[PDB]
């Protein structure tokens, strides 16, 4: 099954990074969708350094490794501040409120982010998303560094 990244991000809600296997990730990481076209998605990527919010306008272009691919499950990003050049959504819940994104950066760092619509709460995360992220972090070859970039002090 393929999971469309333009449907998962087609919301006016903030998409927060709940969990990530990136080592030493930024704080209060989130995306805000600005526009979705047939060629890609314009959004605003933010994080918090020492109380201040840094934001950048990004355009993720839908890319396909063949001509038979039409599901928009992968985006290429240019001029990303952390060197992230590609993102691939490999799982998302049916209500599109949580997803697992494999992130490829230019420094050859590859990690996984568990993203959620709206700010993370202490309730019950979708069981499918949870078991999928558990399976991934269990499948990491040595030293799984899973942290949460979100805090209740993030606005």
Residue numbers in the entry: 48 to 59, 59a, 60 to 152, 156 to 172, 174 to 191, 191a, 191b, 192 to 203
Would you copy out the relevant sentences from the publication that reported this structure?
In this study, we identify a family of complement inhibitors from the hard tick Rhipicephalus pulchellus, hereafter termed CirpA (Complement inhibitor from R. pulchellus of the alternative pathway). Functional and structural characterisation reveals that members of the CirpA family directly bind to properdin, inhibiting its ability to promote complement activation, and leading to potent inhibition of the complement response in a species specific manner. All CirpA structures share a lipocalin fold with a short N-terminal α-helix followed by an eight-stranded beta-barrel and a longer C-terminal α-helix.
Using this strategy, we were able to purify CirpA1, A3, A4, and A5 and determine their structure using X-ray crystallography to a resolution of 2.0, 2.1, 1.8, and 1.9 Å respectively. We identified three regions with high conformational variability between homologs. All these regions are part of the observed binding interface between CirpA1 and properdin, and hence the conformational differences might render other homologs incompatible with binding human properdin. Another CirpA1 residue undergoing a conformational rearrangement upon properdin binding is Y122 which forms a hydrophobic pocket around properdin P377 together with CirpA1 residues F122, Y131, and F150. However, it is likely that the homologues have evolved to target properdin from other species, especially given the identification of multiple CirpA homologues in a single tick species.
